[PDB]
Structure formats: structure tokens, C-alpha cells
Design a protein around this ligand. Sequence first.
Ligand SMILES: NC(=O)C1=CN([C@@H]2O[C@H](COP(=O)(O)OP(=O)(O)OC[C@H]3O[C@@H](n4cnc5c(N)ncnc54)[C@H](OP(=O)(O)O)[C@@H]3O)[C@@H](O)[C@H]2O)C=CC1
Ligand SMILES: NC(=O)C1=CN([C@@H]2O[C@H](COP(=O)(O)OP(=O)(O)OC[C@H]3O[C@@H](n4cnc5c(N)ncnc54)[C@H](OP(=O)(O)O)[C@@H]3O)[C@@H](O)[C@H]2O)C=CC1
Ligand SMILES: O=CN(O)CC[C@@H](c1ccc(Cl)c(Cl)c1)P(=O)(O)O
Ligand SMILES: [Mn+2]
Ligand SMILES: [Mn+2]
Lengths: 373, 379
Amino acid sequence: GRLRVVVLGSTGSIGTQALQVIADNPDRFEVVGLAAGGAHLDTLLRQRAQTGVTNIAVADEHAAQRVGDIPYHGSDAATRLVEQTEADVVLNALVGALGLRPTLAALKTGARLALANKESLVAGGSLVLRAARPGQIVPVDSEHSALAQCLRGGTPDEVAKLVLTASGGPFRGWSAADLEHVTPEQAGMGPMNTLNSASLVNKGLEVIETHLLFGIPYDRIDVVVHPQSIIHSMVTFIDGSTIAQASPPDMKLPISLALGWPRRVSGAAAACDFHTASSWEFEPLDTDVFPAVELARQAGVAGGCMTAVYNAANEEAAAAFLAGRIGFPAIVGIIADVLHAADQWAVEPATVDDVLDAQRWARERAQRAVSGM
Amino acid sequence: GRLRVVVLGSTGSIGTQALQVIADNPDRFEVVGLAAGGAHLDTLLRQRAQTGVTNIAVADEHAAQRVGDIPYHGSDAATRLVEQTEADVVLNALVGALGLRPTLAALKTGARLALANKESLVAGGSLVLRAARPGQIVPVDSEHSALAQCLRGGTPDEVAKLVLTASGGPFRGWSAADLEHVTPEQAGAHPTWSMGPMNTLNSASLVNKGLEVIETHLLFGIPYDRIDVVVHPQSIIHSMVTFIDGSTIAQASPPDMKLPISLALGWPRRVSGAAAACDFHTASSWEFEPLDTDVFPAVELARQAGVAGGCMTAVYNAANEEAAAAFLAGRIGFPAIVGIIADVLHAADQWAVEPATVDDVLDAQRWARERAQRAVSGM
Ligand SMILES: NC(=O)C1=CN([C@@H]2O[C@H](COP(=O)(O)OP(=O)(O)OC[C@H]3O[C@@H](n4cnc5c(N)ncnc54)[C@H](OP(=O)(O)O)[C@@H]3O)[C@@H](O)[C@H]2O)C=CC1
Ligand SMILES: NC(=O)C1=CN([C@@H]2O[C@H](COP(=O)(O)OP(=O)(O)OC[C@H]3O[C@@H](n4cnc5c(N)ncnc54)[C@H](OP(=O)(O)O)[C@@H]3O)[C@@H](O)[C@H]2O)C=CC1
Ligand SMILES: O=CN(O)CC[C@@H](c1ccc(Cl)c(Cl)c1)P(=O)(O)O
Ligand SMILES: [Mn+2]
Ligand SMILES: [Mn+2]
């Protein structure tokens, strides 16, 4: 009665926490596949020995060579592993839009896709949705996990609004002028999600992720700043009732629920402790200073390949910021500049190649924007 | 479709708010019966005129004699109306032990019972539960309505804890020394236009929360040691459920009883536009703090009564009513209320037997009142 789990991005934060959840629950879960990029071979070798899984994908050819005997190696390794491994659940914890092909392959096998890699859904859009049956994608992202639990509070016709909470990042309350001086070390889960959290681009991706997972119109997806990150998101129903999910921050909770959906996993995470005092605070997002969420809505409403453009433009601008080439406020400046030139990408993708064409265009246009700074 | 609703206690706060919800939602609800005590006969008669409902009951015979065309009047008027009226939902918003029999009659008809009357569960206990079938009782009060909604977040087997919120009352965070000085006025403990002095006093003493803990155990079948109370002064979070994985599901709304009332009436279906939703356009905070059980032992005493079972919760509540009355009359200090409940309960083990009849419940209450009177007077 064990679920067979493929873990993509096994050596990262989410991947190792997932392996820990699986280790703690041998009656429910069994690891049958691992994929990693090759930057952390030490961790990967330990994972092979501990799980006893030799069914492994390594993206970097040289790193795979150095290990020896890796059955899937090279840029398509993770995808081929998914295509050729019998599984009940695929956990996609890869980072970036490179998770796109493994997401599509996972869905095509019929397995539950436990999705941490929000970018593959954001980029893929209707192409990823067409590949999925209803409920096949189960969110690992903490907010979306919370939304899915809260939606149990009523029927679909009773949903008024979905309320996505945001930490606000380290620069919550900072002025536009304050942001000009943000260093990479200040804006630094992995380096991409840490940065995306600080810039609010993560929240923008999550608005798009919300629309795609739950089919709710953009004008019914609210974002509220909640610095404590105890409330992970909420749903407001048509009678005025709001149902919210709360827990001390710990990704093992949403990971555990996504792997075993619909069944909750005993002891996954610590519960809220109401025997000590606390406060849960809410404030509006300053959209003038942090316009990334609004840009995401604009990209989402345009639809088609525009969400792929939004993400791809961020990936390049973020890389440039982390390399010390542009200032912090330039990240979202570049995204806006790219999106506003992106007329032709409103068309719905027919194939993966359409998405890849949009991203290719977006990366080039982002470089052009960087070149002008 | 359209639900046929009998409103018991039509002239009180819950009843009149329910009639507003019904007036606003004629496609979903129709009134087919009204019952009141008689103290507000003029209101009931206006309700008859406004709704066109002639199927009415008045408990007080003197009051009934002012009219001449009431079909149900006298001692068990509300019960007889319930027994003889075809209905989908019975809202029981009667006050005190005279809500118990109509609850029992309503359960026997096979109608859904939207329950506000606290005495039905607190005093009636196993009498009521043995009469009820799964899902038949739908709770009207904000905490229990919150729990019912949050329980949708998992299966029964996935529940770790039920967590009730408490406002903390006017003396939130006060010390034992502070409490010695409390006056009836300070406890808000006088008649107001809609509510009696017991409501704010029970809130202030934490006895109300004790009562809600007992009802929680009986409604949802969770052991007392897994029913927690947290102080939340804003009353925006109405209660929460903690599941076995560490996830907590909470229900939140600006205070407005029309929400839990609308949901009790239409259960399982939500009533569009019943109440205003939480608004996050302006900064706010939701605060939580523990209750000092040494200063406020009312909830612990409720658990003690609840665990003992039988008629012990009837004893808890009747001792409070008497102790509370003594405080209101200057006969005892504020901290002595819960002191007297404790003294009565510890002498009450004969009442741990399950009640067979309404009269068994009434006898327990009679005994508890007398015992409380002795404790107050020192006799
Ligand atoms: N971490 C968190 O708390 C949260 C994460 N998420 C999402 O989950 C996903 C991952 O999160 P996170 O664990 O922090 O990311 P990490 O940086 O921690 O790890 C990313 C994983 O992907 C692998 N990887 C990177 N590049 C490639 C590639 N080209 N081919 C194959 N594999 C590759 C890495 O292997 P290696 O490093 O050994 O090369 C690594 O195991 C992200 O999309 C993120 O948005 C969402 C919410 C919270
Ligand atoms: N008020 C609230 O917000 C809350 C209510 N509840 C519970 O719901 C129940 C009712 O609340 P509430 O509406 O405020 O009570 P109210 O005092 O406001 O009104 C109660 C109703 O009961 C009727 N009644 C009174 N005496 C008798 C009698 N001797 N025989 C028959 N009927 C009688 C009254 O008719 P008449 O006026 O003519 O005598 C009245 O319509 C209580 O048990 C309470 O604990 C729980 C939490 C909160
Ligand atoms: O799902 C989580 N993320 O995507 C990380 C980014 C968000 C975040 C940050 C800190 C904590 Cl403690 C938590 Cl719980 C969540 P965001 O900053 O996007 O709300
Ligand atoms: Mn997230
Ligand atoms: Mn209450």
C-alpha cells in the first residue's frame, strides 16, 4: 500500500525534507527515483546509500561521469527518468523553468504531480493544464497547499475570494530610494526563491500559480502582507466566512500533504502553540514600491505564453543582480520592459516548443534591457 | 429548495436576527411557526402580522389570555407546536431549561435542529445525544459554528485538537488581587435592551467558555483533554481545529451572529451575503494569549464536571446561576462565584448517573441550586 515516489531536485532544501518525510513514513511512502543537477554529489551519494535507490538522474555530464554508473545523464536526464520509472507520485522540486519538461512528462504518465517547481506551471500555462486530469497537480508551495485545504470549507460556487499571504521579504516597509542600495547578500531555501521573496516576484509567480491551479479569476485573487508567515493563505466564501490555514513555518507540512493527498500525515510538523502569546499581523502590500505582483497579474490576464515571458525575464534579471551587474530595483524594471514589448506571446502555446520560443525571446530581450544599463 | 423553519424564541436576540436572515432570503427559507415566552407578546403579535404566520405558541397563560386566537398556549406550548408542525428546520433559541423539551420534540420529528439553547446540551447531555442522529444538531453559536466549518479540513480520525477562542472578558489579564474588587457594574452585569445580566457576567467569569467547552465535547465527540481554550481579544478568529499533521484550520469573520445563524439554518449550504467578510485594506492584528487557569479556573471546573458526566454538567450550570445571582445581589464577591461552583460540584458525585428523563435533569438542578444557596449563606 506504499506510494512510489520519484523525487526530482533531491539534494535541495525541499528534496531532502521530502526524503525525511518518506523515511519517517515507510508504510506510506517509498522512494523509487532521484534526480539532481550534480552540484552536490556528496549529498546525492548519501541519498543513494540510505534509500538504496540507484535509479538516478544527474543533469551535469561531467558530474555524472565523476560518480560513474548514473543511468540517466545530461540535460534531458530528469525527463527520461520520469518517462521510464513506474511511480504513483512525482515530486518536482527542481528550480526554474527547466522543470518544464519533467512536469509535462510526469503528468503524461498519470502519476500525481506534487509540484514545488511553480515555474514549470507558470511557464507552461494552458499547455501544462491540458496535460493534467483534474486534481493531478497537488501543490507543495505553502500558500497553495493552504488554499487547497481551505477550499474544503465550501463548494466551488461558494468561493468569493482567495487570499494569498506574503511575508513581505526583508525590505517590507522600505522606500523606493531605500531599495536602490540593496546588495545581493541582503537579498540572500535556495538563492533564487530567497531573492524572489525579497523582490516580490515570488508572490507574482504564486498569483499566476493560484489562477492556474484553482481556476479563479485574477481579480478574485487578493494578496496581503503577513510578516509572521503563520497564516499561509485563506479563502473567503460568499456568506462572509473566511477559512484560513495556519502553522509554524515548516515545509514538511505541505510536502507531506502533497505526497499523500488527500490523507494527512501524522506528526509531519509542529502545530501552532496557543499556550504562549502571539500575534498574527496583516498589512496591505505597497504596490508602488513593489509592483511585481501587479506585473504578474498583467502577464496572467494576457495569458498564453506571457507568463513564460514574465518568469524568463525574471530569471535573467535576477542572475544579473546576483552577479552585481544591475541594482535591485532593476529586476522588476527589466520584467516590465520585457513584458511591454511581448505583444506576440499572448497566443496560447500548442507545443512545448511554443513555450521555449517565448522564453528564448524573453531571455534575449532581458539581456538587451541589461545592456542598456 | 425552500426550507420550512420553525423559530422557537422568536422575540429574543437570536430569533429576531434569524427572522432577518429569512426575510432577506425568501428563496431559501420560509417561516412556518413562531414561539415565544410571553414577556414580549407585543413583538410576537407584530411578527404574526408581518410574516402572516398564524401558527404561533405562547408559554405564559396570562400573556396568552390577552389574544384569544393563539393555537398553542400554556406550559408546553412550544413542544406542542413542534410536535404538530411539518418543518425542515427547527431553530431552538429558547432560553433556559424550557428549551430542553422542545429540543427533544424537535429531534423526534426528524427535523434538523439548529441549536442555540445552551441548556439542551449542558443540562440535557446524554438525554439529548441519545435522541439525536448524526448531523441532526447544527450549532448556532459562533465558536461551535467555527468548529463545524474547520472540521471540513479533514476526516474525524485526523483531528488532534479543538481550540476555542475566548474574548477574555472585561478582566482579561487581571490578577487574583484585581478580581477581588469587581463590582456587578464592572462585570457589565445588569439588564440591557436585548440580553440579560448573565451573558456578560458568564463571559467575564469564563463560565460561558466552560459551558462552550462542554457543548463542544458533546457536539463533536472530542475528549476534554483535547479541547483547548485560547484568549483572542479581537474575536475575529471564532475557533480552530488542529489536525494530526500539525496543520490548523481557523474560521475568521468580523463579529456578526447572522453568519453562524445563516449557516445553521441553511446547513450545509452557505447563504450569500449573510455577513461582511474580513477586509485586509487596512493594517490589523489578531492576538492570542494563554488563559491563567489559576486566576480563571471556570474552564477547568467545566472539564471536571464534563469528565464526571451524567447530570454533573447540569449541576455545574445550576450552581453558576445561583452563585451569579448571589454576586449580583452583593451577597458574595466576584471570585467566590467559581469558588461556590467548585464547592457544589465536589459534593455532587451522586449526580454522576446518566439521566433517564427530563425530571432527572430538573432534580439535579434543584439540588445544585439549594447546595449553592447553603454555600452562600453558610448554612
Ligand atoms: N525551499 C523552499 O522553502 C521552497 C521552495 N519552493 C520551490 O521549490 C523548488 C525548489 O525549492 P528549493 O529546494 O529551495 O531549490 P534548491 O536551490 O534548494 O534545490 C534545487 C534542486 O534542483 C536541482 N537542479 C538545479 N538545476 C538543475 C538542472 N539544471 N537539472 C536538474 N536538476 C537541477 C538541484 O540539484 P543540485 O543543486 O545538486 O545541482 C537541487 O537539488 C523551487 O522551484 C522553489 O520555487 C517553494 C516554496 C518554498
Ligand atoms: N445572544 C447570543 O448572541 C447568544 C445566544 N446563545 C444561546 O442561545 C439561547 C438564546 O439566546 P437569546 O436569543 O439571546 O435569548 P433571549 O433572552 O434573547 O430570548 C430568548 C427567547 O426565549 C423565550 N422565552 C423566555 N422565557 C420563556 C419561557 N418561560 N417559556 C417559553 N419561552 C420563553 C423568549 O420569549 P419572551 O421574550 O416573550 O419571554 C425569547 O423569545 C441561550 O441559551 C443562549 O445561551 C449563545 C451564545 C450567544
Ligand atoms: O512557500 C514559501 N515560499 O514560496 C517562500 C517565500 C514566502 C515565504 C517567506 C518566509 C516564510 Cl517563513 C514563508 Cl512560510 C514563506 P514569501 O516571502 O513569498 O511569502
Ligand atoms: Mn510559497
Ligand atoms: Mn459563544
